[PDB]
Structures are given as C-alpha cells and as structure tokens.
Amino acid sequence: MKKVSVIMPTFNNGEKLHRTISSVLNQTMKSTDYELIIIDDHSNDNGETLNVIKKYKGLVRFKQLKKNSGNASVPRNTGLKMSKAEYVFFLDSDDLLHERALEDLYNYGKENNSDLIIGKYGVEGKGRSVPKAIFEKGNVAKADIIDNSIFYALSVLKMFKKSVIDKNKIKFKTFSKTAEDQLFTIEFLMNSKNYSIKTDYEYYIVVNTGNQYFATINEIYKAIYKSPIYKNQEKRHQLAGKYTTRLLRHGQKKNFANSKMKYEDKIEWLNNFSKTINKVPRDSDKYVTQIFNLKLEAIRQNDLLAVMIADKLL
C-alpha cells in the first residue's frame, strides 16, 4: 500500500506540464512510497499533451478518458477509483509541489492521526490568490474549522485520508462547473475530526443562470446540517453562518447586482440565490459577519434593489 497517490487531471497543458510532473517525481519521499496518477480528459492539442506524458512512461500511472468531461470532477473520480493508497493528494496540472511536500505532509499526518493535512500555499504570477489566514498561526496539529479559517481554504489541493473518502463514499459531483471542489472538502470535513496545518515551506505553488451553482451551494449547507461529527444544532448554525460569510466575501459573481448582467439574468440569479439561502435556518444569521447583515437580508427577501443598495453601502 502506497503512502500517497497524487491525482492529476490534464487537458491541453502542452510542454509546460514537464515542470509539474518533474516537481512530483523529485520528492524527498522514497519514489516507491508514492505514485502519480495522470488522467487526461481527452486532450485535442495535436498530441502535444500526450507526448509530454509519454516521456514519463514507467514512472507514472496513466488513464485516457474517451470524451472530454469539461470539468475536473470526472478525472478526479477516476483517479480516486485507481488509488489504493493511505492518502490522496490532488494536484492541478499547472501547479508545482515543493520537493519536501509529500514527506513532510505525510509524516505530520501520521504523527497526528490526521484525516486532512493542509500545506501552506504559494503563488506564481498575478491571477487567482491563495488562502493566507489559515497559515498565520504556524503549524497546527489539531486545527478547528472556525479558529483556523478552514472555510476560507476549501480547495482539494490537500492531503486527504483515503479511508474517510471510501467509508463515506465521497465523490466529486458533476452538476456544476464551479464549487464542486468546495463541496468535496466540506463533505470530507463534516465526516472527519482530525485536521492538520503545516507551514514550514510553501509546499504547494499555484501557478497563474446559477441553477447548477446554487444547487451545489445547497449541497454544502445540507452537508453541514447532516454532519455526524458536528451534531449539535447550534454548532451547525455557527458553521453555516461562517460558510455564508465566505460565500458573501468570495462567491461567484458576488457583485452581480450592480454589474452589466442583463436584468432578466440578475433576477434569475438572485432567485436561485434566494431559494438556496431560504433553506438555511435564520438561526445561522447571527454568526454571519455583521457588515453583511443588510446584504444577507436583501437576498433572503429576493429583492434586487435592496441587494444593489447593500453593495453600494459596502
């Protein structure tokens, strides 16, 4: 049984993929203790991506999907089915691992009986930013969702204990193109106890209508409110309130109301947002950061003018 399976979807990455694969093969961890599973989502770049992968024949596991799924969920699920390791680590095909990432994260996890180990993120170039607050207290052996800002770091670019995934049948969902990674991490967090944060290095380097989206958000709230770990109803309210805050600070199209979106699309978007939030108990609202009090109430009331106004006052 391998210590770690690194699971990496590819699609039309081309020659730049060398740098990523190289970062995985050059680890302090013993090469025989881990594997890189590459799942190509039917690249169509005149064989450029496949030619890169072929250069590492014998050194990686590889599966080619027959059709392009359009999303990371299907290839990630494929990778999960192929892994029989102790832990999995998801890697995006443009990113880099620090040479000490697998060894340091695995060892910290084993030492602390961790279900989840989160290594400090670094970033290369302007673009998507990375979580920071989660790493500001140094190494944490037994982290807390609220106190260690975990709902602000919900990517799957982390080390997950495979048995938790298997026992709870946690799969990436394919309903929406967005936030399915958050749902996966939330489902995992709500079904496990032991989370660890490791900050010695930048272990992982990120390299730079709403029907479906809000169905995914709805699943996030459902996962919190059915958690067998966080069973206490007031605790669930606190967690839900924190997710609401994160959604208002960082969600997709957070500033839609005053945007150039067509009126009819704003109405439909807000309608989906409103329906989703109105399934979340009002008891969670007091745990939302209070600068958002008006915006949250405007969304509950499904009132576009009031959302527009709330955004002008923020």
Add this chain to the structure above:
Amino acid sequence: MKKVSVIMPTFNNGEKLHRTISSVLNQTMKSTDYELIIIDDHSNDNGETLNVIKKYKGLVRFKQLKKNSGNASVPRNTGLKMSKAEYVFFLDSDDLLHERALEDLYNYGKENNSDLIIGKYGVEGKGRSVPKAIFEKGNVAKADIIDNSIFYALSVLKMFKKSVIDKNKIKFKTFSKTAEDQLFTIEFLMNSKNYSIKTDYEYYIVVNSTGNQYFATINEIYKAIYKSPIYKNQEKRHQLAGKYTTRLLRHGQKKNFANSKMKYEDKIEWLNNFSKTINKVPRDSDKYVTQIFNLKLEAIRQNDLLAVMIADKLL
C-alpha cells in the same frame, strides 16, 4: 392650602434615601408652605427603606401601598389624590433638589401665572442623560413648545399647577412601563398655555419587549396633541405632531432596532407596532419632521424592514 406638594414614590431605595429626603426638607421655602408626600410601592428590602422613612415621622406625609405596582404611575396617582396644594412637584427617590428649588420655581411661576415651571437639570454619574437645549436661552417667562425645545424635556420632574390636573382629570396611565411620564406631560402641555423655564441654578439633580404596550402609549401622545383644546388649529397640531415624531426618532426606545441583534421575528413585530401607530398620524405632520429623518419615517410608514435598515445606515 400649601404652595407645593412634592410627590416621591419609593421602592427598595435603602439608606441612600436619606440624602434625597434631606434635600427636600432643607429648602429656602418656609417649611409650613410645602409638604413631602412619600408613597412606598411595597418595598421588600427587609424593612431597610421603611426604617429610613420612619426617621422622618411627623415631618412628611406617608402612604404604604399593599402591593408593588411595578411602576411609578400608581404611587404618583396616589400622591396626586393626597395633594390639595397649589402646585405639585414629582421627585424620583434617587435624585436631589437644590436648596432654592421650591422657592425660586414657585415664585417664578406665581409672578408669571405659570401652569408649568421647569428648573434646570443637573446630572451626577453616567446613565440617563438630561435635557440641555431647553435651558440655553436663560430664564423664559412664557416659553413656546417648539422654540424652547419642550418636547425634548418631557419628564414630570417639574412643577405643575394642580388645578390644571384636577379640571382635566389628568392621571398617570399604567398600560406600559415606559413613556407614561411623557404622556402625562404632553396631556398637561396640551391643556395649558403658560410655561416657564428657570435656569439660575441646577435646581434638580438626576443621580445615576414586543412594543405592543409602548406603542399604545405613543399612540395616546399623538391623540392628546390632535385633541388639544389649547392648540386648536389643525396646522399647529401637525407641527407639534411632527416635532414629537422627530423626538421619537432621535431619542425613542430601541431607535436603532433595525440593524440590532434583535431576532428577525421580533424586529418584524416591533416595526409592525411602530408602523400601525405612525399610520394613525396624519401625513400632513411629516413636513414638520426634521428632514434628515424623511426616509426613515417613510420606511416605517411602509412597514419595510429593509428600508429601515438602509435608512439607519445612511444616518
């Protein structure tokens, strides 16, 4: 007939009550020209309050209520029934009178044929604050409600002409725990003409819910304005109502409820009561409300919580 009856409810005041009673008994006014009427609202502090009062036996009038009413209204009404003086003065059992208060206020009242005399308030310690603007123009023999800020000084800690109370059957009401003193003063103001303000000293020293009952009291305030036999002109009534609305928005109970930590359902119920009350007040009064409150007032009339929240964010 005494010049003044000082009416003072007590409840579990204990030893500190000495200081208050002493301030009343030590006045420049001739001791035989006034009386202190103490009405105990059934203190239950192991006889501590009653023992203080007993030390002034023979020197004060005293009545013990058999049950604790829970507010000042019942003991104040008891005091009114007991007084046959020319003027009454209500005193809270923690407060102090300046030594010249009864004489100076009475004399100013008699000289100006005053129905109401208001002496300058001082305050000791943080807590409930006192009116200031009413006293910034010095002594005023014939004050005006609007120009002399009287709707911002509606406590009953004042000297009231007893005949006005008797003829108009003005009693403290007991519906709510709050604002019943405002209602009394408003009823008095709306049934009298002559008000005086005296500022030579700090004559009186203040020493530091669904809304169903509170808004019923507020409703009575507006009714008193609109049935005033003194202020009979309808436009004048609108002006007075508008001024009360302003005071309510500046100083009312839970004025900032909309963005508070109150539960949503309680905000809705509170605003519902507020809205019902305000919507019995003619819209003709709205133009006499200080105009920074125009949006907040309209939001309340529309019973629209989001709009009230927004109005408060812009104030």
Add this chain to the structure above:
Amino acid sequence: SMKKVSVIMPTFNNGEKLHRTISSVLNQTMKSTDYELIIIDDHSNDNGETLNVIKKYKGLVRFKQLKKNSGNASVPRNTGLKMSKAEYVFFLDSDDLLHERALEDLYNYGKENNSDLIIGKYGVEGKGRSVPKAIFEKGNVAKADIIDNSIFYALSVLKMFKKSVIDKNKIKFKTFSKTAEDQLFTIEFLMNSKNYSIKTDYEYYIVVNDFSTGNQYFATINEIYKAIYKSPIYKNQEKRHQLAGKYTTRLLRHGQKKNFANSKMKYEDKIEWLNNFSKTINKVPRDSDKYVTQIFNLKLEAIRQNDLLAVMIADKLL
C-alpha cells in the same frame, strides 16, 4: 422672393419691454428684405399695452391676433409656421434678444453646410433659467452628432430650422402638456433630418431673465421616446437604444421635479407622479439602459420597479 428666414415670435402681456426684442430683430446685418418677423399675440389683456408696442412696427412685421389665450407657446408657434413660406424659421421668445449678426451668420453657415438645423451659442442676462454650455465647448461644428455634441442637452426651439423638413414631415407643436412640447418638436425634427450645425463666434441668442399629476408631462415624454424609436434617419435598433439611453440620462439630470422623491410633495402626489414616470419608462426597451450614465443605474431601476422608497434611497446616494 422666398425669404431666407421667418422669425416666429409669440407675445402675451409683454408690455413696453417688447420694444427691445423687436428692435433686436429689425437691426440685423442680414438685408431687411431677406427675412421677416411674424408676431402672434396670444390675446394679451394688459389694457392694450402689448398691442400698442406692436402697432408701432406695423408695416415692418407680420402680425396675427389670436381670439383666445391658448395658455402656451405651441398654438401661436403653429400659427407662425402656417404663415411662413421662408427657407428657414427661427423661434424667438418675446423677452429675449438676437445679436445683430444672428440671422446672417447662422443662415450663411447653414447654406454653406446644407444644414437642416443651425444652433447659435446662447447667452444669458440675469439669474433664472440657465442655458446649455457643453454643446458649444468644441467651437464651430459643420456636421454635428447628437451624442458627441450634447444636442439632447439643448432641445429648445430657439434655433434655425429648415422649413422643408417641417413641411414634408408635418411637424407641429403639440398642446397636450404645458411643458416639454418644445423638446418634442426638436426631437421630432432631429429624428427626421441628418445635417446639424453649431455656431459659436458670438452669443447669437440672449435669454433674458426678468425679476401637476404628470399625466400630460409623461405623455409628452412618451412621444419623445416614440419619435426616437420610429426615426427614419436613425433606423438601426442599437442606435435607437443609444439615443433613448442618452435621453433617459438627460431626463434624470434635468427633468421636471427630478428630486420629487425626497421633497415635501404630498405622499399621494409622489405615488401618482412615480406611477406615470414608471409607466412611461417601462415602454422604453431595457436594451437602452446600458447607454444611461451608470451613476443613475439604481435610480433608473427604482423607477422601472415603481418603488418610491428605492427612488428616495437612490437620490440620497447621488
């Protein structure tokens, strides 16, 4: 012997001060035989004071007396149009003044540039109604554009209009409302012609200041939007949206009672006013909204939603 210009001037109870206006028209650099002043009195009742002034210029002006006071400039202006057989007309308000070079300079610039419309720079005397400025900030413009030369911000009829455009398209002043009928006339003209000129060498026209449910007003505004959306000149639908959006902006910047929402207007009148405003705007395609200046995004949406509180709030944030 078709005249170059007919100046059309309604009068009502102007009295002795009318001398100054009439004199400004008779003292032009243009040859006196090349133009005419048509005076239409809207039944003055000032003990013959206005008529006595006009009588002093008998034989130098054309004159028509209306039997009843219409109450607005539309009827007398229409009377003037029927009487004119000139190449161009120029509307003049009875309190205002023409610069001595106005008819000659504007006509010549128009003839040189085949202009349907010539706009001379406005000056103003005394505090009161203001005059457009941005339209004149680029100097002389031979072939102006409605959007780039701010023409929707200068919609008075105090301008030189080619008469054939008025005749062919049967453009008449409407009498439904007491307000904005001049805007509608200018808009109808603009939407049925191509060539506009701006002349700024002098203050050619001097505005002299002397010291409502909305049912009719918004019906007039409705006609403005209809004229834009049926323009045979601006036929492209996206261009129509752009023009409509610009008019909406002008309406929100300068319209009648623009700040009604937070005013001391009675509540029921605010509601009725907003109701008329809302009904009118909701006949204008939402595709025009992106061409409205975006500080007005909330106010415009509040009006579309017929929501008084939201209009009040929008005005507090502007």
